[PDB]
Paper text:
To study the structure of PR- Ty3 particles at higher resolution, we collected a 2D cryo-EM dataset of the purified particles, identified the icosahedral particles by image classification, and determined their structure to 7.5-Å resolution using the RELION single-particle processing pipeline. The particles have a radius to the center of the CA layer of ∼24 nm. The location of pentamers confirmed the T = 9 symmetry identified by cryo-ET and subtomogram averaging. The reconstruction showed clear α-helical densities consistent with the determined resolution, as well as a disordered internal layer, which may correspond to NC and associated nucleic acid. Consistent with the principles of virus architecture described by Caspar and Klug, the T = 9 Ty3 particle capsid is formed from 540 copies of CA. There are nine different (non–symmetry-related) copies of CA (one in the fivefold, two in the threefold, and six in the pseudothreefold positions within the complete Ty3 particle). Comparing the nine different non–symmetry-related positions, the fold of the individual CA-NTDs and CA-CTDs does not change, but their relative orientations change. Notably, the trimeric appearance of the sixfold coordinated positions in the EM map is a result of adjacent CA-NTDs existing in two very different orientations [Fig. 3A, orientation A (cyan) and orientation B (dark blue)]. To generate a structural model for the complete PR- Ty3 capsid, we placed the models for the Ty3 CA-NTD and CA-CTD from flexible fitting back into all nine independent positions within the complete EM map and modeled the linker connecting the CA-NTD and the CA-CTD independently for all nine copies using Modeler. To assess the conformational variability of CA within the capsid, we superimposed and compared the nine independent copies of CA, showing large relative movements of the domains about the flexible interdomain linker.
Here, we have determined the structure and molecular architecture of the Ty3 capsid by 3D and 2D cryo-electron microscopy (cryo-EM) and compared it with those of the retroviruses. In the case of Ty3, Gag3 is cleaved into CA and NC domains. Formation of the capsid is important for genome protection and is an essential step in the retroelement life cycle. Similar to retroviruses, the protruding capsomers of the Ty3 capsid are formed by the CA-NTD, while the inner layer, linking the capsomers together, is formed by the CA-CTD.
Numbering used by the authors:
A (entry chain F), E (entry chain B), G (entry chain H): 37 to 191
B (entry chain E), C (entry chain D), D (entry chain C), F (entry chain I), H (entry chain G), I (entry chain A): 37 to 195
Amino acid sequence: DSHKLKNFISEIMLNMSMISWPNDASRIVYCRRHLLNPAAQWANDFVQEQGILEITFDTFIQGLYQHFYKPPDINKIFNAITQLSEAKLGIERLNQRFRKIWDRMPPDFMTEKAAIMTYTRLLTKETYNIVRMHKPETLKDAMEEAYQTTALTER
Amino acid sequence: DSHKLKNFISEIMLNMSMISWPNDASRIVYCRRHLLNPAAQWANDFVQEQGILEITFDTFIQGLYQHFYKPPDINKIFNAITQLSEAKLGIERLNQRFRKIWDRMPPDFMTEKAAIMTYTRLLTKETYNIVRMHKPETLKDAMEEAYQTTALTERFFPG
Amino acid sequence: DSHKLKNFISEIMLNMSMISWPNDASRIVYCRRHLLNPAAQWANDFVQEQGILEITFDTFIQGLYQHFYKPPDINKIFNAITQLSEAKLGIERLNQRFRKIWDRMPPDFMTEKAAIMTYTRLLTKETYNIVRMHKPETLKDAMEEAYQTTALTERFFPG
Amino acid sequence: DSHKLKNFISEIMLNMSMISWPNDASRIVYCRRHLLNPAAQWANDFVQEQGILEITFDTFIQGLYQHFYKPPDINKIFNAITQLSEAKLGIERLNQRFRKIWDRMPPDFMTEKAAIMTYTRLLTKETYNIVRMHKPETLKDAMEEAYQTTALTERFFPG
Amino acid sequence: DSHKLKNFISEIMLNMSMISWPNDASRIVYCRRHLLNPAAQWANDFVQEQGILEITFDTFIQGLYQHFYKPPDINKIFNAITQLSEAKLGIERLNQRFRKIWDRMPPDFMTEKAAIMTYTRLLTKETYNIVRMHKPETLKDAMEEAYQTTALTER
Amino acid sequence: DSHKLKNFISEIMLNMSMISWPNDASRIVYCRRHLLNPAAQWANDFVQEQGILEITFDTFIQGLYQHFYKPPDINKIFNAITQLSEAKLGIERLNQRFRKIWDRMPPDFMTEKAAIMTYTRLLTKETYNIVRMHKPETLKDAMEEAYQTTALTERFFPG
Amino acid sequence: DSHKLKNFISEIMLNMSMISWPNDASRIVYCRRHLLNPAAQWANDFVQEQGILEITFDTFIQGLYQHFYKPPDINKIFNAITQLSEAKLGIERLNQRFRKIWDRMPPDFMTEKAAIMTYTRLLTKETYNIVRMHKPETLKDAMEEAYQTTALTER
Amino acid sequence: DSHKLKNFISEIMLNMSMISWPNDASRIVYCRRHLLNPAAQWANDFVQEQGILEITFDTFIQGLYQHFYKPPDINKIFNAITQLSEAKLGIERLNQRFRKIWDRMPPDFMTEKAAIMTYTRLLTKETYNIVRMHKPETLKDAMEEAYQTTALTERFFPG
Amino acid sequence: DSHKLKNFISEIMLNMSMISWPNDASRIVYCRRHLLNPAAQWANDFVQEQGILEITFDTFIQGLYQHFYKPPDINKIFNAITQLSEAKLGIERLNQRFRKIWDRMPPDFMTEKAAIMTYTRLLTKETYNIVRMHKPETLKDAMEEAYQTTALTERFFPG
């Protein structure tokens, strides 16, 4: 439920972002309309609890953030990661599959170098070569590099 | 159908609650739009029956309340509970299946120790052993313990 | 055609009801737009026949009411009722089947005792015994009693 | 026995009513004379049981009321009604048979249209045709019509 | 002879009761006319014995009461009670038969609960069920209940 | 296709008639939206052919009139009518079959008495008797009468 | 592309025609929205080239007319016309087939009498007879007449 | 996919350009609506990745540019060009086939004389003769000349 | 050589840190004394290269930091870790083997929870059970727990 919910919040925030809002009170309330029943129930209670007009949109999202917490299911995520080999047709499958798995469920997981070691080891030895020359600093860069070389002379 | 319907009414009422309504007539009618066919059919007939403009939103919900509710002491839940054995592949099936059945339909059912006795008896004798050492106090803890030991040295994930 | 038409009128009337109308002439005319061809043809003729600006929305609906006065001629319902025997597996089939048939099409049919006599006679002699002790006053009570005794020491559930 | 008995009491009470009685004791006793054996047996015992001169005429009738007037169960009457088909030779059998069954035991049963639907459905399809043209409003009219057409171009007489 | 005689007295008393009597002397004498020979013989002697005009109608009936009352034998009554089973067609036979037997011959017999236990045990197990729900407090109530349920729905 | 099309045009024209139009160009174009594919194809071509802004709504309807003047069909309808005898099981088949055939394809055909003569002659001599007593004035009344007498002392139902 | 484009312009012009426009500038611009990429590219360039607010809707359509009308190959159209005989089942095939071929590609082709001579010669000798009595003045009338007689006693 | 995509971006940008935008946030988002599924998937992820309200419309298009701008595969185009011989039946096949291949994928390729040398060499020696007398200056002229001589004393037509 | 060298630098820096230095020149030079031959050779050259009195102690250590840079080890370490299964006889082999591999080569590697996940997953499912009840917070605790339960109720090897 929680992974979808994290996505849900981002999007809603974006939609709100482009267009102009005339005041904060309207905006905090508007969030409530999209929500699903237990969350919606919670929302009512939270609105009551605050006797003030509101306390900002961000505060309210943080109560939601607080709401959606899984116990750390690190094993499932590790296991998911283990499954991918290079029998997955080319870069594209891997990149999209990895995105879903990785992005969903980390609270802070492992450090930046570690994330690159895990991502990189999985990749064909050839692809590590080009990507090494010159190196990515982040997982998005690694993924963008591998896809770009494959995609450019293909796609 | 009735359990979902009770939830449905609550939510609808909430949605309505936050925002402002300019008059009652609109509001009573708006309820009709969300409803499903037999209920919707009933609704039309009820609207006709009242020759007045309306009689309040609450009245209309009470006709719905009247339409479907479960009586107290519903054996169906016991029977549902009886069906599960350990032929259900591992913890995961049982935990999810039990959640649906148990969570739906109790007004106050039975006490906390009793709920643990019923949940626990169902479980493999082996699993009761580990779970015993050290004990859960609530049904969520029992369920979390059994799943965690199985899941940890096993498992896959969602998304 | 007539049963749908009775529903159609109710709804249309409701839609109209919530929002405000500035004058009657517009409202009577607006009804014509939704209608289907023969009815629509009739409508034109009726509008002509009245040389006055209009005579009220209600009058016009009454001409429609008149156009299809009562949907059943009590026969089909009796016949439907006749069909059920006790070859229908147990209470559950009968209760659900009877609900559909009975609830649909009565304007006022027969009196309360009569409805219980017809419902009760149909039931197995055994079931009448328990139900007699102690008696139902309404068809819903009879149906609830028969189902409850069968269901309690038996049954399964929905969702 | 009970339906006749309820009639019997009413009449007896009426006869008594018009003329003057000089005292209650005579009147209570006089009731006993008309009664039939088991009831009469009961009566003797009841008179003994009351050591006082009497307790009023009404009290004694209430013991009789107690003795047989029970609320009727519609089922026997429905069942009776069910038995007739058109294998009963012509109108005459049906009309007389129906009279006995129907007239005995209704407190208010079912409404007027319903009574005509039940009576009419039973009749041959042909006879419904003539009777329809032009319609009866009451069960006596239906019965009179069916008999009259059959009788007129047929029949014999009593005495 | 005595059981019939007790009935006889009641009736005679009733007949007398409705209509008016102009004086007591006539009334006491009139009783003598209906009576049968030994009793009638006794009556003559009693009338002589009283040198006064009369001593009241009631007194004279009490001499008759005195004449007839003999001690009963409970065993015949018990034995009578024993005979009934449920081979007697339905409630009606039993109720009428029991009335005759029970009502005749008790001076004080047994207590109220006991009388209900004896009456009730005899009845079909089914009938005890309905009658139990809700209970009779007296033998007349038990008898009225059983008859009413049977009677009401049919025959 | 043509009979429905003649109806279609009338209705569309009516709908347009009640409300106000601000200019002719919009109105002529709006007709195109409701139309079905071959007709719609034609419409495009016709719009092109006229280099002027438009030539009136009526002109455009006349091109449609022209399109479905009629194929020879009165004969087909007569022939269709001829086919029914009383070998068709009872009233129900005939009434439904006749409805389809008759209702489809008349622009004005024959007069009201004539329509009753054709309908009535077809019917069994017996049924004409009851229906005569008392007479129908319209084809719907004749059909309703014949069905009602048969249906009442007989019948089953839909859903 | 050009035949469709000629149709496209006509229609667009019609849609515009019925409803009211408050000013010319809006109208000229609105045309651009419906157009497809190369044409759309051209449109941008043309709008720039005119430094004035606009020069009328008609002018802009003429640039489009200019775009599409290239020289047509009259031979192909003649050849197309030659192919039809009376082996085409009845009027309906011919009329529809002729419409497509003729309507597409003429800038001014041949004169009105000539167009009737070409259309008429193609038709069965019988049909020319009825159509002669009384004559059509335009190709649409000829086509309507032939179809109407066939269609009426048929269709 | 990439060639179409480059066109797609240009156009979208143009449409946006003429009319006024009230703020950047709306505009960046609006781009997402037109896009096709994988690209759309990417878009969602990119929007999330930027925690700020947005970073400009242009930035977002650059991520798309990044996604599928392949160098035009000059080799593929050359290779395509190589395949045609004069075994292709006459001018018509060649002209249409060449149009597709050539027109798609050049950013600036080669100069005008070169394009004529490549086009001309491919053609039958005979056809070069007539076309020479008198010469084409552009590829469209060469193509038009060759087709016209063949077509004129030959040919068929479209529609 | 590099791992020891990183340790060496830290320590030297510490020793220097506690006590006071009167000037930077002395301090930079003093570092040279502890160093081993190739590094020492480098040092001389570096001192010459700087014509200024010195550039700070930190700068000089950075040249050393620069000197260490080996190709990355972490892969080898992961691979080493991968090799162990439970085919290694009991706890003792694993614990000692893991100690060597893990302790050597991390600069900061991964976080504390991660290190426990990697250590724990490797262990037999049974051993995770006891160790879970009650949990270790550090890798030394996990290792001590597993060894203690095995060791306590076991025989140890003589040498």
